[PDB]
Symmetry: D3
Subunit: 256 residues, 6 copies
């Protein structure tokens, strides 16, 4: 794997094996993965498969997705490696690529965010709605998402217009990065690097979640959370430090 | 807008013609869903049937059923208009009336339910149960056809909303995704919440049993409410306790 | 007439309910005839309806139907679980007064039975197919159950939306679960890491049960609880985090109900 | 009972035939209820069924249905032609013993009525739409009729496959046409260049009638003929090229049929 | 092949596995249509239902109807096998048994008709009329369900073929596209041709009325036949005249 | 027009006008024509729209059609100009491109012929069948078709495995270029340049049709036809010269 490497080449090897083992899916795997020359082309194809509709032709969606910021494709690879690292249900890179709804919703949003920043708001709203119907995930096209993100299970995830997510964040299903008040402007959470958010937690308002903080499942967070702090409860309260500094751990290993 | 000026239908058409001009690949969708029609109700029946049509019941048949149900009770479309105005007022992500009309899952689920409720009360329970399941699959929203919903309702995001058979909702209520207006016990009879006017319910809160929520109460996100809530009280926690609204949408629970 | 007051054919009662619905609703008559009345068994009906739900251009409904039919034929315990589930929903859900209502229209019943077949496909080594269907189930039903999760009989998953059960989750028999419930994992390592739920448990809406913990038989998890430690039998737990707050059962010695009829 | 022996409601007879078919064939009951029985008029049924045939992802069936309904409402002569056609098929086709059979299942009847609406759309200036539908008709029905072609009432196009009628073709009333017939043009120039067919004509299978020629009333074109010159009334023509070979009608003075009952 | 060796079903599977290996985007189609099945009849029911399925009657329902009809008369599949062998023998464009099975419109129309005929004789006339129209739309072939077809029949290209209510076809007949076995008159009763064994009919020929075509006659392309044709006679022209066969497929008319 | 020129540019102008006049079709015209950069890309898109099916994804067909011999695209343009010239029902180039089934069947065959020559016979047979179902046209993938062809109406056209067509030929619906005998090898007609074939004519066997010959509608041709000859009847017989030499016509015009 990538921790001991060509991601695209490994996905091709996993997929050709799956196609050989499952004749039911051979032509799906060949048309979605093997006939393509790059991971980005595969992703555009598979995402258009998911979100295409009578209104929005899969071919038209596929072309738009292919035409979409080479930074997006760098985030995609980081996201895939993050899932491999952090999700014990994932032992193959092609498993989230083809079958993890939260991975799909994140990458669909990245493209949606580009279309929205390009001024194609009606199209982005149409696709925001389609993502919510098909993936059970509602991300406002203006939300800004860093790389190395994992959205495990995904169902019920909500992130609003002014939400900002840093890098290497892990999020469970049912999580809300929600707004407060009836006025526009900054009103959704900003999440620092390294944060973990447990299932069905809510983070509400224009509050900051510090780097490497941990939000326990079921928490309702309505105030800032300092870096390296764990919060729990309804409403959420600091209960522990989420990570130990080297000076606290005193780990003397120097091998690796 | 409706707070400044106002013709809701004409504003929607003007917004839609603008969208079609800007996004030519959506132009025919917008012309067929909105601009070719002559009333808001016909647009709603068309768009809802596009969402919920399936092999079992195709978009054409559902369109005719929806037009017939709307025609049988002209007040449904009145609640539709009130809901659209409520979303415009209360949701800062909404600056155009046609945005919830066309793209907000919670708006579609609520109006789909109003038609289901009409069909159910007409005695068409099997059809209403089919459509309840269809709404749950497509929108992620489970509303029993017997539930009674007022006007000026906003269901933001919508995913995971549940309201059961004996639930009753007043007017000008605001609800977030994940909210449960759920039952208790294995017996029939009144067993679901009754929600007063002006109430706001935060994300993933649950309200369970035959209990009353007083007018203008606020249910904090993540709250679990199992007993009556007096008017103008704010409750937070699991179980929820009084500690301190559909118009203001303030989500603070501290 | 029902399974609680008649010495009772589930399949024939479902056929009779369906013939009645078809005569009352011409809009749905041919669906009911193709999905229910033209079939010879409840298992064939279920395989047909489920493949209708999860089929796609990728996965032909006819092929899925045959796969589901063969899987039901390969593991006849599944159909017995199916029957127990329908009776459980009839017994416990006051919105259910007919057996064909959950069979045709309750998404939580569909997701459970789709998983039972999915689990069989997984055990037979069709893991790619099982992962494809896990994803399809999550999309169509809003329910994410790992194919390796183990589910007993007499289960009710009411409303269903948002239910999650992970790779090493185990559910016993006669369990009742509301929408939004999580039987979730902890940590980045493989091995046993999801809850094991004993017989008779009730789990309320949007509760989360996390880690390799045991929920004892007849326990009750209140709506919205977050459970991160073992829960002993016959205990009710509430809160975030969840704490024991009461005994879950009323003993006959406490009730003093003297009826013998 | 029918239109030849009852002083007769076409629409209500069609409803009665359809209710009978729906009760006998549960596979088709909901189609018959959605296509026929839930409607209030034959024109609404026709618009619904035709849009089912010619609709596509490009052209939403619901939009086409409304366009066809408005076109039928804009030109109430079309529905009168529709009724004449159904009676003509009942009278002349021995395979037809029920009025709803061509209405629902005869491709030549569908193509003719689709053209009548197509012609109206063309005259109103919706030429792009009419060309789109001309192509759709050719694909789905195997029938190519230019939107500018003019068709009278009481027409039967039996089997239909391969029928072609070009831009300046004109068909009178009470004409019978078999599959494979061509009312075709000649030359690379615009202007009148297709046949004009008089009342009462019969045209046999795979005949071709080419150029700006006139086929006189009550003429008969035998199957397989190629007609490139005018044909006078009451004449039968046969061959490649076609030549007059007989008189097409038996006069009462020749038959000497003395019945007065 | 069946003239050299022979197992038709096994040869079809071997051909199909070869095709799937060569054309990976068709592999799942071939596995789902052919290789997953255990008999030729089940493949035919599956593939015909893929062709004729529609919103009114979906591929699944038609598949079950077709399997039931085939199961009710095991001789249909016998005629299917004879037809496939006839096409292999007589059509130089056919060097594999699975090519007509999967890709020849005329083969599909004929087998679709055999099922229609069974349904029609069972009394399911409405369903048979629906499928007759469906066959006409999809295949360009109009065969009345009451028509009687023998075995070893080949309909090459098929487009425009018409056979009416009282038509009767013998065995080992070869027919090209555009051929009419048509009626005459406005009255019921026998009014369509009866075709003897071994007859060959060229492209776009018509045979009209209650007339008999003798065994091994040859009908030239473009012929119009309105009276009986004796056995082993070749006729050409409009109207057709004797001037001088399903195995040899010689199209000369001079 | 091209007789008094950019074909692709004229089609774009015709199509933008049609889109402006017909809101029902605006997004179809935009997705099929206007969003593309070349006529070949439009043709690949529209053909895949016609022949796509559940088995054969429109995206997969579109990619294959786009990947398909830059001579094919030259024939396409010649075919479009031929229809404009010869068909009085055609006064716009985009009319046959989008709505003439015979134009579609010919171009679909050209691509099919390339796939077949590349050895993808199963795919070509699949598409031959699909063309026959959707267009009512049966052309064997091995048939070789020249440029400047017009197939007017198209329904019932049949051309077999060894048929060869030259350039600037005009063919009506119902025409058969058919084989004879049960053996392989050359057994279908070879059609010379400039030929016209009328409706429902049949040309059978390994016979040669000479350049600028004319086959009357309803003819059955079973022997060679010399250049510049018109044949009529069942069976067909020479009846006239089809074109006049300059020496026969004595036209003295020298203007144009
Ligand atoms: Na992992
Ligand atoms: Na607003
Ligand atoms: Na119950
Ligand atoms: Na009749
Ligand atoms: Na052969
Ligand atoms: Na022209």
């Amino acid at each position: 794997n990538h921790l001991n490497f060509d991601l695209w080449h490994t996905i091709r090897e996993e997929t050709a094996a799956a196609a050989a083992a499952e004749p039911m899916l051979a032509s799906f795997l060949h048309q979605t993965v093997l006939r393509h020359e790059s991971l980005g082309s595969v992703l555009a194809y598979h995402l258009s498969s998911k979100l295409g509709s009578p209104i929005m032709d899969v071919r038209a969606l596929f072309e738009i997705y292919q035409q979409a910021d080479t930074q997006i494709s760098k985030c995609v690879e980081a996201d895939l490696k993050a899932i491999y690292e952090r999700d014990p249900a994932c032992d193959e890179y092609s498993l989230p690529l083809l079958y993890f709804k939260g991975f799909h919703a994140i990458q669909a949003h990245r493209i949606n965010h580009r279309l929205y920043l390009d001024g194609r708001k009606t199209l982005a709203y149409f696709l925001q709605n389609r993502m919510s119907e098909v993936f059970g995930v509602d991300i406002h096209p203006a939300a800004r998402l860093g790389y190395g993100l994992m959205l495990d299970h995904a169902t019920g995830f909500v992130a609003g217009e002014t939400a900002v997510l840093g890098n290497n964040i892990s999020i469970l299903h049912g999580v809300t990065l929600g707004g407060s008040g009836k006025e526009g402007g900054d009103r959704h959470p900003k999440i620092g690097d390294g944060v973990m958010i447990g299932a069905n937690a809510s983070i509400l308002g224009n509050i900051r979640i510090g780097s490497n903080a941990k939000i326990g499942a079921g928490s309702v967070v309505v105030s800032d959370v300092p870096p390296s702090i764990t919060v729990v409860g309804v409403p959420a309260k600091p209960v522990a430090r989420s990570l130990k500094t080297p000076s606290a751990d005193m780990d003397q290993n120097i091998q690796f």
